[PDB]
């Protein structure tokens, strides 16, 4: 009986920008609002108030109007999950189980896909604003000889910034769920055939079928948070060149901007994925011991 | 996504170092720290010469050393022997549980030495002919590199029917070795003067000769 | 531990092969990588058991399958609709750790299996006709002439070819054998033996073909 299914998330068909329910639903406005500190510091173009007030405020209300219009899709499987993942529930009814599990594929999927194709005007602006970063970084004196001094502040900066993420222990939380969820494959296994109990293994099967989900979810932003983590450690302690070239400082911020706002785009979800792997682990604890 | 991107041919002393790259994209390479090595030696399995990147597994010397900076992951050979000579790989971890390899980088050391080939040439034999058949039968052995190109002359006249060369193939003494035949008719084998089969190695062209 | 594939194989075209992959608790994932002559390696797909989810790359929609046995711990990867561009190497490598390798899964830094190579061809199993290519006296290269004999026209791979019944090994140098273009093989063995033994040593070449259940003694003799 969850009442939250915050953890779905779509990729596009060319796997490069990422959609979630929760705000600010893109990994590259938290880059956008990275950026309007990168112009805060050189003069050249420190008019940063037209980008934050029309363009990117516009993006966010546009993406968070467009998830609206798939709140009835929303809302059809959050009940269809009620009442599959509970025995009680599902038999109060009397449709198949067979027949439930083809509908939630089904349903899921037209809402997942109803997040991506409401948004394939936001993808496009979102490249709109990747060209107007590089065509407004243009503007600076510098060219062969830029430099790099703001970039190594910022690197300072990301330091702090993920020490206050525990990934020591969304480490140690992860691999205590996978280990409690395949030991609970394994028992429903060995007595789905010594108990005659179908519409509630069944339903316990039903759980764990969005269980192995989550945790593909939730592994990948703890894969793309180390490397935030372990790309920027290297910078600090790598090479620290005073000059470089336009085109390459265009290339030194669109990299770290990329990892910091994929960090806190990761921190987001995480925190996210944390009560929604509980959640469903709660529902295994009670209908295990309401199978004994 | 994408195969990975990698120079098909590494060259490096014995003493010195040698580096390869391996370019791809922000969903595989770029996008997780899960990139690995692998040298290979052909017809056995793969051996893992670098995890994560940057990790050494158990055994492997520490003169092996990756790394990677955005999205061109590079591994460093330091101190090459002559163990070193094989195909090395790079591979790394992809969106939705997909998993991505190189195009490979042949690495080769430069401590042999450089011999020409010694070519034999066998004409067709009595049994052969007996059965409306012919094949000049031309062996190619002792070059280093392998890299041979074989030319038949049909008396002085370039001939390019029947012709059916090997890839070259090292031997035990780790020279190369390489041959050529060349199908015939009774009645081609009995109208010309003499058949030639030129072997071009390194600019140097080594030519024997056949005749009824 | 350690991995065990089964033998080579030799199909034909358009037909169906499996191959195996025996192991030594069956929670990692067990993947399948091939290499084509001149090519490089190519994953293709993976196998939770414990999850029961299989995956599979993009080049290969519905060609491969790959099912698992958790009686006896083997991973099957079977081969449909099969082209003379599918011979290759095929190797099964399982990841390192147990779901617990971070978060690289598949990830192929694990044991890998010792090989299995499959040839697909559309030739039928031919035995050699094998020539004695007779010493030639005019060009005795300083007194070491050379004689051989010429395996033409066999398959499959490979040959067996010894000389004096495995007695004489000085000289002996068989070389790799020829893909015709009509799909079969063809190679050579050459024995540099002494000038003035040619006309007193008798020398046999023995080439066995199992597949065919061949064996073929050819004398090679000086030319008269």
Known sequence: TTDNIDYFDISDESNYYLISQLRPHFSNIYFFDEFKRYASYHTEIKRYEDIHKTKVNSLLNEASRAIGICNRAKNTVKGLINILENPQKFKTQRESYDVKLRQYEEKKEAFRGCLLNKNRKNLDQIKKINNEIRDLLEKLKCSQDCQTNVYFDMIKIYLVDFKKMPYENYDTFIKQYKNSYLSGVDMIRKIEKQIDNPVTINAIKFTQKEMGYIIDRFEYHLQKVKHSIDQVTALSDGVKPKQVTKNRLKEYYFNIGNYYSIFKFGKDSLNMLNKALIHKEKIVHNLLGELF | ?212 | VQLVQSGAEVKKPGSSMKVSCKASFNRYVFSWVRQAPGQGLEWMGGILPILETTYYAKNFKGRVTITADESTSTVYMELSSLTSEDTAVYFCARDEHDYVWGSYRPSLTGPWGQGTLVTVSSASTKGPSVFPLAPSSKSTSGGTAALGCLVKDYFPEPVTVSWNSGALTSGVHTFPAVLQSSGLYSLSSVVTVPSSSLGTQTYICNVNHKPSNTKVDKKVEPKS
Do not use: M
Not at chain 2, 134 to 148: K, M, N, Q
């Open chain 2, 1 to 212: 996504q994408s195969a990975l991107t990698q120079p098909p041919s590494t060259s490096g002393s014995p003493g010195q170092s040698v580096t390869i790259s391996c370019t791809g994209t922000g969903i595989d390479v770029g996008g997780f720290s899960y990139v690995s090595w692998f040298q290979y030696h052909p017809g056995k399995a793969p051996k893992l010469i670098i995890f994560e990147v940057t990790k050494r597994p158990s055994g492997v010397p520490d003169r092996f050393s990756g790394s990677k900076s955005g999205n061109t992951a590079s591994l460093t050979i330091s101190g090459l022997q002559a163990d070193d000579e094989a195909e090395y790989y790079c591979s790394s971890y992809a969106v939705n549980n997909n998993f991505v390899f190189g195009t490979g980088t042949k690495v080769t050391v430069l401590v042999s030495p450089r011999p020409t080939p010694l070519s034999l040439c066998s004409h067709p034999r009595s049994e052969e002919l007996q059965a409306n058949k012919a094949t000049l039968v031309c062996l190619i052995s002792d070059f280093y590199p392998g890299a041979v190109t074989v030319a038949w002359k049909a008396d002085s006249s370039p001939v390019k029917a029947g012709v059916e060369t090997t890839t070259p193939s090292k031997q035990s003494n780790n020279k190369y070795a390489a041959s050529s035949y060349l199908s015939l008719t009774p009645e081609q084998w009995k109208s010309h003067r003499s058949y030639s089969c030129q072997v071009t190695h390194e600019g140097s062209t080594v030519e024997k000769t056949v005749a009824p």
